[PDB]
Structure 1
């Protein structure tokens, strides 16, 4: 046992995945990011924060400041929150 990994073999693979352009996000392209928000909001009235994070590949706190800018939030159950640009 323990045929020494010194750098764990899965962990190496995960770092390798990371070793292909990660850890930097658009934020920065604001307007183009707004375009993604407008496009997404066209598909459905409300979305989970997690779906927007996958969809726009940007820091969450910045996206929150945008959702404060053009929308509101609507929570239900156990902290299950969805955001919406107040359709009317």
Structure 2
């Protein structure tokens, strides 16, 4: 009864169904994305790119372009170089 034939594993279809339902992240307008980024900047001084993506919920490439337009990354000697939301 072990390794019985199966078209797809239950864990795989459930994950696939969840991704399909959630769908891919869309490209929001720059103004709305900028407003969300600046609003969240008050909560903390610095954000990680991966963590910032979850908050903004925008494509990584699109988010990076917006962040590059204003934001910059500072080299930190404690963990690694991370993005700083302050343009200056």
Asked if Structure 1 and Structure 2 have the same fold, meaning a TM-score greater than 0.5 normalized by the shorter chain, the answer is yes
What residue number does 1:42 align with?
42
What residue number does 1:57 align with?
57
Q: Quick check: 1:27–1:58 contact (8 Å CA) kept in 2?
A: yes
Q: 1:26/1:19 Cα in 2 relative to 1: closer, same or farther (>3 Å)?
A: closer
Q: Quick check: 1:53–1:60 contact (8 Å CA) kept in 2?
A: yes
1:32 is paired with a residue of what secondary structure? helix
Alpha-carbon offset, residue 77 of structure 1: 4.7
Provide structure 1 residue ranges, at least 5 long, that are not aligned to the other structure. Answer: none
Distance 1:25 1:15 in 2: 17
Q: What do residues 19-64 of structure 1 show as CA deviations (whole Å, max 9, x unaligned)?
A: 5522321312322222210111111111111111111121111111
Question: Going by fraction, where is strand more abundant, 1 or 2?
Answer: 1
Distance 2:44 2:26 in 1: 23
Stretch of structure 1 that moved more, 40-49 or 25-34: 25-34
Distance 1:84 1:71 in 2: 6
Alpha-carbon offset, residue 13 of structure 1: 4.9
- Cα-Cα RMSD: 2.8
